[PDB]
Design a protein around this ligand. Structure first.
Ligand SMILES: CCCC(=O)OC[C@H](COP(=O)(O)O[C@H]1[C@H](O)[C@@H](O)[C@H](OP(=O)(O)O)[C@@H](O)[C@H]1O)OC(=O)CCC
Ligand code: NA
Length: 310
C-alpha cells in the first residue's frame, strides 16, 4: 500500500467519522448508527484500525453531550441485546443490537485512546426510550424487507415495538419493567400483536358464516385453504407487514387504499355471524386493521416531529 493510498483511505475514514460525529451531535441516533456502521466497515475493508485513525482526529472533538449520548446508547443496547435473547428467538434480534454496541464502541475508540476516559456532560439527561427507538429505527433501515425475527417480519416487529414505546411515553409509564416487556417481546401473543382478540392458527370460533375465500375471485393462493378466524388472522398479519412499509403519510394513504381494494379486505369486512350481516356491523378484524392504520399514522407523525429536531 503506497503512502498516497493510505493517506486517501485515512482522509475518507476521517470524513466517515465526521459524518457520525455530526449525527451524534444532533442527537440523530439512527443516522449516527448508519454512519458508525459505514466507518467501521470501511476501516475493516482498508485494514485500518482505531490507532491508525486517531492521530488524524486531533482537530476533532466528541463533545460532552456526545459522550453522554454514547454512554446512554451503550447501556441501552447492552440491556436490549440481553432482553431480546429469549426462548422464542435469541439469534437475530440480539445479533442486530449487539452490532450497535460494537460499531459505537469503534467510533469512540477511533478518537479516545485506551486509557483516556470519556467526558460526558453530567447534566445532559438522555431519554432511554428515545435511544431504544433509535436502535429500532436503525434495525429497520439495515434489515432486508423480507427478513424475520421468529415468525414475524423484522420491520413490522420494529414498528410494533416503536409504537409500544411511544405509548408508554404518552402514558408516562416508561420504566425498566415496561421497557423490558417490549424489548423481550417477539409478538408471541398474536391477539396483542394483531390487535385482534380472535387471532388464531387453529379452528377458532364456530360461526354461522365462517370466513372463506370461496365467494372471492382474486384472493391470493396462500389463503385458499384457510377458513374462519384463522383466515382473518393471516390476512391481518399480512396487512400489518404491508403497513410497516409506509414511510410518510402519503405512502400510508396509498398502501391503505391498495389494501382496501383487495378481496382479502372484503373477507375481513364480511360478518361471520347473522347479527353483523343483518345490522351491518363493522367486524372485529376491520377494527383491528383500522387500529393498526391509526397507530402507524401517529407513529409516523411522532417520528417526523423527531426528524425536525435531529
Ligand atoms: C349492535 C351492538 C351489539 C353488537 O355489537 O352485536 C354484535 C354481536 C356479535 O355479532 P355476530 O354474532 O355477528 O358475531 C361477530 C361476527 O362473527 C364478526 O364477523 C366478528 O368479527 P371478525 O372476527 O372480524 O369476523 C365478530 O368478532 C363477531 O363478534 O351480536 C350478538 O352477540 C347477538 C347474539 C344473538
Ligand atoms: Na361455520
Amino acid at each position: 500500500v503506497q503512502r498516497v493510498t493510505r493517506i486517501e483511505n485515512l482522509e475518507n475514514a476521517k470524513k466517515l467519522w465526521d459524518n457520525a460525529n455530526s449525527m451524534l451531535e444532533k442527537g440523530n441516533i439512527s443516522g449516527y448508527l448508519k454512519a458508525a456502521n459505514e466507518l467501521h466497515k470501511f476501516m475493516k475493508e482498508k485494514n485500518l484500525k482505531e490507532d491508525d485513525l486517531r492521530p488524524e482526529l486531533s482537530d476533532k472533538t466528541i463533545s460532552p453531550k456526545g459522550y453522554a449520548i454514547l454512554q446512554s446508547l451503550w447501556g441501552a443496547a447492552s440491556d436490549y441485546s440481553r432482553a431480546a435473547a429469549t426462548l422464542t428467538e435469541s439469534t437475530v434480534e440480539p445479533g442486530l443490537v449487539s452490532a450497535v454496541n460494537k460499531m459505537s464502541a469503534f467510533f469512540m475508540d477511533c478518537k479516545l485512546s485506551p486509557n483516556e476516559r470519556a467526558t460526558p456532560d453530567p447534566d445532559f439527561k438522555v431519554g432511554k426510550s428515545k435511544i431504544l427507538v433509535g436502535i429500532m429505527q436503525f434495525i429497520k433501515d439495515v434489515a432486508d424487507p423480507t427478513s424475520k425475527i421468529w415468525m414475524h417480519n423484522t420491520k413490522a416487529l420494529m414498528n410494533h415495538k416503536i409504537a409500544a414505546i411511544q405509548k408508554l411515553e404518552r402514558s408516562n409509564n416508561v420504566n425498566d419493567e415496561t421497557l423490558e416487556s417490549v424489548l423481550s417481546s417477539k409478538g408471541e401473543n398474536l391477539s396483542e400483536y394483531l390487535s385482534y382478540k380472535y387471532a388464531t392458527k387453529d379452528e377458532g370460533r364456530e360461526h354461522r358464516y365462517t370466513a372463506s375465500t370461496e365467494n372471492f375471485k382474486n384472493v391470493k393462493e396462500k389463503y385458499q385453504q384457510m377458513r374462519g378466524d384463522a383466515l382473518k388472522t393471516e390476512i391481518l398479519a399480512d396487512f400489518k407487514d404491508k403497513l410497516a412499509e409506509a414511510t410518510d403519510e402519503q405512502s400510508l394513504k396509498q398502501i391503505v387504499a391498495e389494501l382496501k381494494s383487495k378481496d382479502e379486505y372484503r373477507i375481513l369486512a364480511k360478518g361471520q355471524g347473522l347479527t353483523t350481516q343483518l345490522l351491518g356491523l363493522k367486524t372485529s378484524s376491520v377494527s383491528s386493521f383500522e387500529k393498526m392504520v391509526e397507530e402507524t399514522r401517529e407513529s409516523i407523525k411522532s417520528q417526523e416531529r423527531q426528524t425536525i429536531k435531529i
